[PDB]
Design an enzyme around this catalytic site. Structure first.
Site, short mmCIF file in Angstrom:
data_model
loop_
_atom_site.label_atom_id
_atom_site.label_comp_id
_atom_site.label_asym_id
_atom_site.label_seq_id
_atom_site.Cartn_x
_atom_site.Cartn_y
_atom_site.Cartn_z
N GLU A 1 33.70 33.24 -6.36
CA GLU A 1 32.71 33.18 -5.28
C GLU A 1 31.60 32.15 -5.52
O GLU A 1 31.06 31.59 -4.61
CB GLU A 1 32.06 34.58 -5.11
N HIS B 1 31.20 40.91 34.46
CA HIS B 1 31.16 39.85 33.46
C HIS B 1 31.91 40.26 32.20
O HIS B 1 32.79 39.52 31.75
CB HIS B 1 29.74 39.46 33.12
N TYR C 1 48.94 33.29 -2.85
CA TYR C 1 48.85 34.24 -1.75
C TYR C 1 47.56 34.10 -0.99
O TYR C 1 46.57 33.67 -1.52
CB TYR C 1 48.98 35.68 -2.25
N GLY D 1 37.08 16.12 34.88
CA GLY D 1 36.20 14.98 35.09
C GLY D 1 36.94 13.73 35.51
O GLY D 1 36.31 12.79 35.98
N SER E 1 40.94 34.66 -7.50
CA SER E 1 40.97 34.99 -6.07
C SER E 1 39.68 34.45 -5.46
O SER E 1 38.61 34.84 -5.88
CB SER E 1 41.10 36.51 -5.86
N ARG F 1 46.70 7.81 40.63
CA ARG F 1 46.63 9.02 39.84
C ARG F 1 46.01 8.76 38.50
O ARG F 1 46.25 7.72 37.94
CB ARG F 1 48.04 9.62 39.63
N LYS G 1 50.99 11.99 31.77
CA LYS G 1 51.48 11.90 33.12
C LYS G 1 52.32 10.66 33.26
O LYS G 1 53.46 10.73 33.71
CB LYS G 1 50.33 11.92 34.11
N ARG H 1 55.68 18.61 32.46
CA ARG H 1 55.07 18.76 31.15
C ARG H 1 55.47 20.12 30.57
O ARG H 1 55.97 20.98 31.28
CB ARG H 1 53.56 18.62 31.26
N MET I 1 39.35 11.36 37.79
CA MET I 1 39.34 11.23 39.23
C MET I 1 40.51 11.99 39.81
O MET I 1 41.63 11.83 39.32
CB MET I 1 39.41 9.77 39.62
N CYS J 1 41.10 36.14 -0.84
CA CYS J 1 40.91 37.40 -0.11
C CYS J 1 39.70 37.33 0.82
O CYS J 1 39.07 38.37 1.12
CB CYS J 1 40.77 38.58 -1.09
N1 LIG Z 1 53.29 9.12 45.04
C1 LIG Z 1 53.26 10.40 45.42
N2 LIG Z 1 54.02 10.90 46.43
C2 LIG Z 1 53.95 12.20 46.77
N3 LIG Z 1 53.14 13.08 46.16
C3 LIG Z 1 52.33 12.70 45.16
C4 LIG Z 1 52.35 11.31 44.71
N4 LIG Z 1 51.48 11.21 43.70
C5 LIG Z 1 50.93 12.43 43.51
N5 LIG Z 1 51.46 13.33 44.39
C6 LIG Z 1 51.18 14.80 44.51
O1 LIG Z 1 49.85 15.02 44.97
C7 LIG Z 1 49.13 15.88 44.08
C8 LIG Z 1 48.12 15.08 43.23
O2 LIG Z 1 48.73 14.62 42.02
P1 LIG Z 1 47.98 14.66 40.62
O3 LIG Z 1 46.48 14.60 40.94
O4 LIG Z 1 48.76 13.73 39.75
O5 LIG Z 1 48.18 16.08 39.82
P2 LIG Z 1 47.17 16.63 38.60
O6 LIG Z 1 46.68 17.92 39.27
O7 LIG Z 1 47.96 16.83 37.29
O8 LIG Z 1 46.05 15.60 38.36
C9 LIG Z 1 50.26 16.57 43.32
O9 LIG Z 1 50.73 17.65 44.16
C10 LIG Z 1 51.31 15.51 43.16
O10 LIG Z 1 52.63 15.99 42.91
MG LIG Z 2 31.29 38.96 -2.48
MG LIG Z 3 49.52 17.34 39.34
#
Ligand SMILES: Nc1ncnc2c1ncn2[C@@H]1O[C@H](COP(=O)(O)OP(=O)(O)O)[C@@H](O)[C@H]1O
Ligand SMILES: [Mg+2]
Ligand SMILES: [Mg+2]
Ligand SMILES: Nc1ncnc2c1ncn2[C@@H]1O[C@H](COP(=O)(O)OP(=O)(O)O)[C@@H](O)[C@H]1O
Ligand SMILES: [Mg+2]
Ligand SMILES: [Mg+2]
Lengths: 847, 850
Positions: A723, A456, A829, A104, A742, A95, A25, A338, A106, A809
């Protein structure tokens, strides 16, 4: 060293290659800032600051905060706004981002840096409803993400105001209504945590940075890294970035897009946009987002600038891109990019089209279609549907499209067992729990009598591409009798069954399967793979349908033809094998073998007819006798290492004398009709060189006796299957007497690890949990152990015979990491199942 | 090059070391001639002449006959007699001999060189009846051995003359009677083959030499070399030697002796002598030979010269000697010598006594008691006979002495299977055929209800030393019901039974077995082996009786204590094991394990009590659960390959509460027994380690439960934790394993199984066939495979030591007792071998012999 990297207008201290210190990022934010795109300015705290945070007892180091203040001065200088200044407010986002996208971490906090004074000045500058809505958002998100307060406590004050005032939707709240909801949200802090909300933006920011660092050690993150063996990452990066506001009006919004269609590959922008919202509101699903063609009309300047920027990013990254962008009052901002995920059909098309565009070359195109992409395109179909249309017994729901042919099993244990034994299994049960998933992955098809299109088994099988028929209610399953009934008709365990998950039809017995792989872009792509690969690809074919089917997939010969599979022919083959299996005096034994050459010579004739011009490598009778079910003498304690392979073939030499005569007599027969025949004889379970030389004497003897039947013009090769680990230990003595090696990596893994595959289920998945085995050694080859035996047996073999053709094989011929390893060792092969042939053809090309 | 080697008075062209070109016979004939003994002069044709004969199309090489004539000129010059000269006749013997004593070779022809003229002159010189009797012998032997005529055709002309004349014994035939029997024997040639007898001694000799050479390619010889893997010997030697005559009269004869008693080791001449006879007549058993004390009185000069010569040979060879000698008119002649075969008791005594005499040193004494000698002295006895004297149910014949304790089986198939499974089996059948021999070798004891002291089971078991009771007639055996009855009492299959083949008693249930090894010469000898050996010897002990029994045999600790064998104790252990074997929910599982620590801690206390001061190495629970003999329970435990199923540490990483239980048991019994001054050095071994993470998992559990157990008292007990190297991959990645391990121990049973790809219990369909066709030079479960499994042992030891210098590396497989294996493990540089308690002295000797 340096741990804070800024990025702003036309400049950035980092680049897209520094993902280890900046995460994808922060790295791509720097790269887009360098390219010249409108990226909101900010800074990235290194992952090594997160590692140092996690090791000094959850504290900021001395220099880090002052170094953050330096970068903040850069952001404040460019934005012409200070943090906490009601005249010129600078609002931030915090971010998270690691080198690999992972759960996980933040969640991002937006609109950071707000309090009563700043909102007053912000409402004065930019509109009141915007300001108090953004302050509502900040209190909600900051409390949620940084203070660990549930989001429900804020949503309930929202719905409480909607009830007490009688408003319905969010849009119908006035500025003063939001100004009161701000006060209610502030009270949530005191009601939930017993502390009031931070008014000081410097403390707000510090708590957010500490929280992103704390999220690295979060239980969800630790569970992700522990379950995926994800090592080497030492932290996450923190990206503090200036806020652009997609909710200032109806000329602002947030959006996401792929630069091309990820399902179909079409070169058209594929995205969504939501007007008057922030961040992830486009994905949250409460409000309905609009498509890009709507933004083309109502925000034309931002759309033209967006098409420009997407053309620039494809030019720079040279790939299809997944993008996050935000518009603030007709001005476009880029906030994340990305390489976009896509399907197999999309990956192939985007790859081929990018070659025709002169954006990438063919070597990079081969390296951009994963083998999991190609697996989505090799799902089998039935050869002729009208052939089975009269054998359909039941019809359920077409849960996951496909076509499967296999034997009926009633448990996921038997499905794992039968897949390890080499059977094709169809798992029939009333319904599926997650406790069955392992066996569900082993079965060729799934059949359930309950649940709908979102069952499921339905959802699970759609994720895999496995054939599944769901909710076939006229089936009554009985696990205790090992049977299920369709009306009056009973189907027992081990009976053959076929499923068309595209139509949902349940079909009696075996059916003819075929590959569909017809795409012009795919044909061109696999043309590139065949040119680029050094390694050859053979097939593991027994039936003559599998030989032609394999040759159609691009196989360059047969690396393994199991003779025991020749006994699935008829009443006259299955009943005659019991004569040899219950042979007493060798006079009694010779009557069953000499009454079987037409039974196999015509069978072999089917193989040579389909594979004319390419080498066919036939093994001798491998498996033990007591699996075509006097009977007490045949019962063994460990049939994996019992009277088996060449051991029954040196003892009882008339079996070798029989089948070797069959192969040579069918070779001369089929050779006379102009079919070019290059046969090879493979001796299994060789552990001593004298075992091989015994079978070579029998092979040379029966060969010279067979060349009395006409002209002797057929030159042949005889070799071993490696083998047994001892064969790898004494390969210098074996390679002198052998024409080819083989590797049978099923048996070699079994005996190297000391694992019976059919008995591994009581501990194997538990070993995968605790990181004892990084991979399944039967799917992925073990380079540190089994690989040493493959290495030494190949080196000793080649050193004793320079003209030694060495192949493999085993089931590992399809796995890409294994094929990469076999090119490393320098094999000639790989041989694998016919439908897996293109996978190996791609895997052999990607190195 | 040189192919004829002469030997005569005080000189000989060869010596006792040239057995490759002269065979033992010709080599020792040369050596005796060099020493100065009275050896009849002769010559030896090399084995290389036999090799060249067998490859040039059955012909003599160019110079060989002229070379033979040179040696014969030497023999003629010394004897003052020419071949074929009736005035001074030289008679010869033609003898075979290879480097190793072996069957199929041609039997010796005596009295060669006779015809009508020569016998006339010989009768004129030395007596008529002697001459025609020798001519009788020559026609008989020469026709038999060279011309392929059966010996019966000559003996029937003899008995025909005895009938037609009315004589009874051979002595009652006159010279003219033998002169007529000579004519009859000559006619046998024409009657059998259509050709008359060679009169020319030169053609007689050439036919005899051709015959000895032809005998090398005889089917019995080819069968012997093919069955005993004898390669590289390329021929036999031919010894042409001057005849001395033990039948000239009553002052002549033939004899044989050992220089000492081969059964008891007594330093007294042990031999026989027959008067007025030739060659093997002393051994043939028609006439009754006399002892040497008779010869002392009636042939005193020859007996003084014989005692002198035997003292000289023991001095020269420095060993007990097997001798052949012949007297001609009071003059002694020596005709063969070699190192005599003897029993274990004799080998030990003669070895010790020869050390005390300063004839050999201790290093050579260790190299002269074979391990098969020592095995004859380690046959177990009962600890206290009076304990079982009231449990005797039947009493049969004491076929082969010994003592056996095992389970009742009714077939040789079940005997082979139960011996491969680790059980002790007693084979009970009405009588034994040779089709049972394989299983008879697997059983610890044999019980038959028929046959006497010379029964099949009796003779076979005497050859092995296995316990056998024969002809116990009050037993009624029923193979179809798997039972036998003694009166009203029924004994089912798998029941415990004991046999005293020394007294012939059939005994109920298990009894205590003990070694008898009480010989003072044996104790001294094994003292020498303990001093000479570098390698240490541990024991594979489970029961506390086996620990003390092992410590008595000289064990320096326990290298393997199987915890599963702790469960074969009583109602309170065998019934409680079924609780853990049928455990479902870990709440259900923890109720069986936590109710079992006293069940095993007292069991372990029995091991520590016997083995105080020496290391005890206890393994964790190796075998799978499904061999402790419910529709939902028993089906989950059924496996296709239980050798490589849920087993060893794999059930111990899965289900960690088993390791938590038994690791707590060992440590709590360690502290308990340590407080009573008993020095305790415990070791914990983790089986089936294939990945280093498996080991480290068990080390974390071992270190955890160890520190928790050291809450009970002092933590003063320092310990070691290590792996068993059973899996080939462990040998491949041993550099990562040795860093986390304190010791290695090679489980060569499982390592051989997985390296060769052999299931031992399933090898019988092909194994003996592989032994026939030379595919396997040895049984890989008895003898360790150096070219294959040995590489894994080599690399795992090298990688282990290179990753940890203080790494103690041993082996606790069945190969710890085999001498060639122990030789190999000293080669690799291991620290100890561990083997069965009664096999401990065998390893103690095998570790000393390198
Ligand atoms: N400085 C900023 N100004 C405006 N929008 C932001 C800013 N930083 C993040 N965002 C937007 O808010 C959301 C949260 O960003 P982020 O958590 O980086 O994405 P990800 O889901 O990859 O973790 C996204 O829609 C992002 O484009
Ligand atoms: Mg065998
Ligand atoms: Mg994002
Ligand atoms: N030249 C000889 N004069 C007297 N006796 C001989 C002569 N050669 C051999 N013998 C005796 O005749 C028999 C032949 O023995 P031989 O079979 O040659 O040895 P072995 O069978 O132990 O290998 C023996 O009794 C031997 O002592
Ligand atoms: Mg002799
Ligand atoms: Mg074992």
């Amino acid at each position: 060293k340096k741990r804070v990297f800024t990025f702003g207008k036309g400049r950035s201290e980092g680049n897209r290659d520094m993902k280890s210190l900046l995460g994808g990022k922060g790295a791509n934010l720097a790269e887009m800032s360098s390219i010249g795109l409108s990226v909101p300015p900010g800074l990235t705290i290194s992952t090594e600051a997160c590692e140092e945070y996690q090791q000094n007892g959850k504290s900021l180091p001395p220099g880090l905060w002052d170094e953050i203040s330096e970068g903040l001065d850069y952001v404040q200088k460019e934005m012409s706004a200070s943090l906490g200044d009601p005249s010129k407010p600078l609002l931030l986002s915090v971010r998270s981002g690691a080198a690999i996208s992972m759960p996980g971490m933040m969640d991002t906090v937006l609109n950071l840096g707000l309090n009563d004074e700043v909102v007053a000045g912000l409402a004065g500058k930019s509109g009141a409803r915007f300001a108090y809505d953004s302050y509502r958002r900040f209190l909600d998100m900051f409390g949620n993400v940084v203070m660990g307060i549930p989001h429900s406590l804020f949503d309930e004050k929202l719905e409480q105001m909607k009830a007490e005032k009688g408003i319905h939707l969010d849009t119908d709240l006035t500025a003063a209504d939001l100004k009161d909801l701000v006060e209610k949200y502030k009270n949530v802090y005191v009601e939930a945590k017993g502390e009031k909300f931070p008014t000081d933006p410097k403390k707000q920011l510090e708590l957010a940075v500490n929280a992103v660092f704390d999220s690295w050690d979060s239980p969800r993150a630790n569970k992700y890294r522990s379950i995926n063996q994800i090592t080497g990452l030492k932290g996450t990066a923190v990206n503090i970035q200036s806020m652009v506001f997609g909710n200032m009006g109806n000329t602002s919004g947030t959006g996401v897009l792929f630069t091309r269609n990820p399902s179909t590959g079409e070169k058209k922008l594929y995205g969504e946009f939501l007007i008057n919202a922030q961040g992830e509101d486009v994905v949250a699903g409460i409000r309905t987002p609009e498509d890009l063609g709507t933004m083309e009309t109502c925000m034309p300047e931002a759309y033209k600038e967006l098409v420009e920027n997407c053309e620039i990013l494809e030019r720079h990254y040279k790939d299809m891109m997944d993008i996050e962008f935000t518009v603030q009052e007709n001005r476009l901002w880029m906030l994340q990019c990305r390489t976009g995920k896509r399907t197999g059909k999309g990956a192939v098309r985007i790859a081929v089209d990018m070659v025709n565009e002169g954006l990438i070359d063919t070597r990079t195109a081969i390296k951009r279609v994963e083998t999991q992409h190609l697996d989505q395109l090799l799902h089998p179909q039935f050869e002729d549907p009208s052939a089975y249309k009269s054998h359909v017994v039941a019809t359920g729901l077409p849960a996951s499209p496909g076509a499967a042919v296999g034997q009926v099993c009633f448990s996921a244990e038997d499905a794992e067992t039968w897949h390890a034994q080499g059977k094709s299994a169809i798992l029939v049960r009333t319904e599926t729990s997650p406790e069955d998933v392992g066996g569900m992955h082993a079965a060729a098809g799934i059949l359930t009598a309950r649940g709908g299109m979102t069952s499921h088994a339905a959802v699970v099988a759609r994720g895999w591409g496995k054939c599944c028929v769901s909710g076939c209610a006229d089936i009554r399953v009985n696990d205790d009798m090992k049977i299920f009934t369709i009306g009056d008709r009973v189907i027992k365990e081990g009976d053959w069954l076929s499923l068309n998950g595209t139509t949902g039809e349940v079909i009696l017995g075996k059916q003819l399967l075929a590959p569909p792989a017809m795409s012009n872009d795919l044909e061109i792509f696999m043309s590139w793979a065949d040119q680029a690969r050094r390694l050859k690809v053979m097939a593991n074919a027994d039936t003559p349908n599998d030989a032609l089917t394999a040759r159609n997939n691009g196989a360059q010969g047969i690396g393994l033809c199991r003779t025991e599979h020749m006994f699935f022919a008829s009443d006259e083959r299955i009943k005659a094998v019991r004569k040899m299996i219950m042979a007493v005096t060798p006079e009694q034994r010779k009557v069953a073998l000499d009454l079987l050459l037409p039974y196999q010579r015509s069978d072999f004739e089917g193989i040579f007819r389909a594979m004319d011009g390419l080498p066919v490598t036939i093994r001798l009778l491998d498996p033990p006798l007591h699996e075509f079910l006097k009977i007490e003498n045949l019962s063994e304690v460990n049939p994996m290492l019992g009277f088996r392979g060449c051991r029954l073939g040196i003892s009882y030499p008339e079996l070798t004398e029989m089948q070797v005569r069959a192969i040579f007599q069918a070779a001369v027969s089929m050779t006379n009709q102009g079919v070019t025949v290059i046969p090879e004889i493979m001796v299994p379970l060789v552990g001593t060189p004298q075992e091989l030389r015994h079978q070579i004497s029998v092979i040379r003897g029966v060969a010279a006796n067979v060349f009395a039947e006409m002209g002797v013009t057929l030159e042949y090769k005889v070799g071993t299957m490696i083998e047994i680990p001892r064969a790898a230990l004494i390969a210098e003595e074996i390679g002198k007497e052998a024409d080819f090696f083989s590797f049978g990596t099923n048996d070699l893994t079994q005996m190297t690890f000391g694992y019976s595959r059919d008995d591994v289920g009581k501990f194997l998945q538990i070993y995968l949990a605790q990181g004892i085995l990084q991979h399944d050694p039967f799917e992925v080859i073990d380079q540190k152990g089994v690989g040493q035996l493959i290495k030494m047996a190949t080196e000793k073999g080649r050193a004793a015979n320079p003209s030694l053709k060495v192949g493999i094989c085993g089931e590992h011929g399809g796995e890409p990491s294994s094929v990469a390893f076999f090119d490393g060792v320098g094999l000639d092969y790989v041989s694998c199942s016919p439908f897996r042939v293109p996978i190996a053809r791609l895997a052999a090309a990607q190195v």
